[PDB]
Ligand binder design. Structure first.
Ligand code: HEM
Ligand SMILES: O=C(NCCN1CCOCC1)c1ccc(Cc2ccncc2)cc1
Ligand SMILES: [Cl-]
Length: 410
């Protein structure tokens, strides 16, 4: 029995996500075809011209793919499964210069080096400044009376976390945030004029200057740890540091932002959970917010060899797309997946990916950012009420909220 889906339905179609999350359609796949060939017509593959991909809708399958990086490659086609339909292949392949889109051994070396900058100690060192900034952000928003929650509450703290972790001087944080904002969303009419190429080039230029500077003047950020050689001589070259900064500027911005906005939309829809949150401030809330928000709807891999996955024969060269948005609501794994439960524990969501070589190195920074902002929102605008519907982002792989007017005072 084929799944009950519109003909030609494409789970990476940005026009879907500009309007809604295709929740019923994912549930239909989990029930009727949990691994399903998602065909794509010529010219309508979001930059990929291979006729389609396998949709992976079950959490255990997402985990199996993520564990078997020796078979399922990030490098061959990158992990983003949708660009503009006319993107040039060469512009896909430049994604291979960042860790995210690298296979072992190149990935292994870089991840080892980069891990020096995401130690528990490094991230914990940011806690107090980010807590102060969260309080001020929420205080300033509450003072404005009403406004765009996305811009006045969700946007700033993730960017300040990247700035603090890298040690970007305050006067440069405006340009850092601009470069970060120019790298995402170019398929949405609101961002049709952003130039991700120019911004990445400018950011690499900035980052290599910083690398050269912080090498002369060792400062207690992660940068020194990254560009000073270890016993084996291992370190990021200046351009590798630049590629890392580009990666972090993209990774550390919109996904956490959209977690915050959709977490508050969930609280607005589930007032008992919001009352419980305000009273107890459970940090398990962060992971339920990430599960509920699944800010990365999907990442892909490419099979390097034939591989049988839950009874389906995957062929060498085919893409598989891990729909984290489906896996995070998998009825076989979660009890009442469509209940928003901020006490859910354990919460084995794949919002940060499946465990494996490419598991999100920023997961605990994101969780901290989320816990700190919602504490500040509870402290300063406990009674906020939405004014109108969120405006969703046109993207085939990011679950984004562009705008959401709320009354911070109720
Ligand atoms: C709620 C926010 C976030 C979400 C939903 C998220 C999601 C993910 C996912 C799903 C992956 C898996 C990649 C794969 O298997 O192909 C990943 C990896 C990654 N994340 Fe995040 N992430 C978030 C925040 C962050 C932050 C704040 C940072 C950095 C400051 C970050 C940096 C990275 C990096 C560098 C990787 C790639 C690691 C590697 O290839 O070894 N992420 N993230
Ligand atoms: O840097 C990323 N692409 C490569 C960018 N090029 C680098 C060099 O040439 C110019 C451009 C990238 C792509 C997607 C994400 C999404 C994400 C969010 C949170 N966690 C993990 C992943 C982040 C970074
Ligand atoms: Cl559960």
């Amino acid at each position: 029995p084929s799944p009950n889906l519109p003909p030609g339905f494409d789970f990476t179609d940005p026009a879907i996500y500009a309007e809604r999350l295709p929740v019923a359609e994912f549930a239909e796949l989990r029930s009727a075809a949990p691994i399903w060939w998602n065909g794509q017509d010529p010219g309508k593959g979001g930059g990929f011209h291979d006729g389609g991909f396998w949709a992976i809708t079950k959490l255990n399958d997402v985990k199996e793919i993520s564990r078997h990086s020796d078979v399922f490659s990030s490098y061959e086609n990158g992990v983003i499964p949708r660009f503009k339909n006319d993107i040039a292949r060469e512009d896909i392949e430049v994604q291979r210069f960042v860790m995210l889109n690298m296979d072992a051994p190149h990935h292994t070396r870089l991840r080892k080096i980069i891990s020096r900058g995401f130690t528990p100690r490094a991230v914990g060192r940011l806690h107090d400044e980010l807590q102060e900034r969260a309080q001020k952000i929420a205080a300033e928003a509450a003072a404005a009376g009403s406004g765009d929650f996305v811009e006045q509450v969700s946007c700033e703290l993730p960017l300040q976390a990247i700035a603090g972790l890298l040690g970007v001087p305050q006067e440069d944080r405006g340009k850092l945030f601009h470069w970060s904002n120019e790298m995402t969303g170019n398929e949405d009419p609101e961002y049709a004029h952003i130039d991700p190429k120019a911004s990445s080039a400018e950011l690499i230029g900035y980052a290599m200057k910083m690398a050269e500077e912080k090498a002369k003047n060792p400062a207690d950020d992660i940068v020194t740890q990254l560009i000073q050689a270890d016993i084996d001589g291992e370190k990021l070259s200046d351009d590798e540091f630049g590629f890392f900064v580009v990666m972090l500027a993209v990774a550390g911005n919109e996904t956490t932002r959209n977690s915050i906005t959709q977490g508050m939309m969930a609280f607005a829809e589930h007032p008992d959970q919001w009352e419980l949150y305000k009273k107890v401030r459970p940090e398990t809330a962060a992971d339920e917010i990430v599960r509920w928000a699944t800010p990365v709807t999907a990442f892909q891999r490419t099979a390097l060899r034939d591989y049988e996955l839950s009874g389906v024969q995957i062929k060498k060269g085919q893409r598989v797309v891990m729909f984290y948005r489906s896996a995070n609501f998998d009825e076989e794994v979660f009890q009442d997946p469509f209940t928003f439960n901020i006490l859910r524990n354990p919460n084995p969501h794949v919002g940060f990916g499946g465990t494996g070589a490419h598991y999100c190195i920023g997961a605990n920074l994101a969780r901290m950012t989320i816990n700190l902002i919602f504490n500040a929102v509870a402290d300063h605008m406990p009674d906020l009420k939405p004014i109108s519907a969120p405006e969703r982002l046109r993207s085939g792989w990011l679950n984004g909220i562009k705008h959401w007017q709320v009354d911070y005072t109720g």
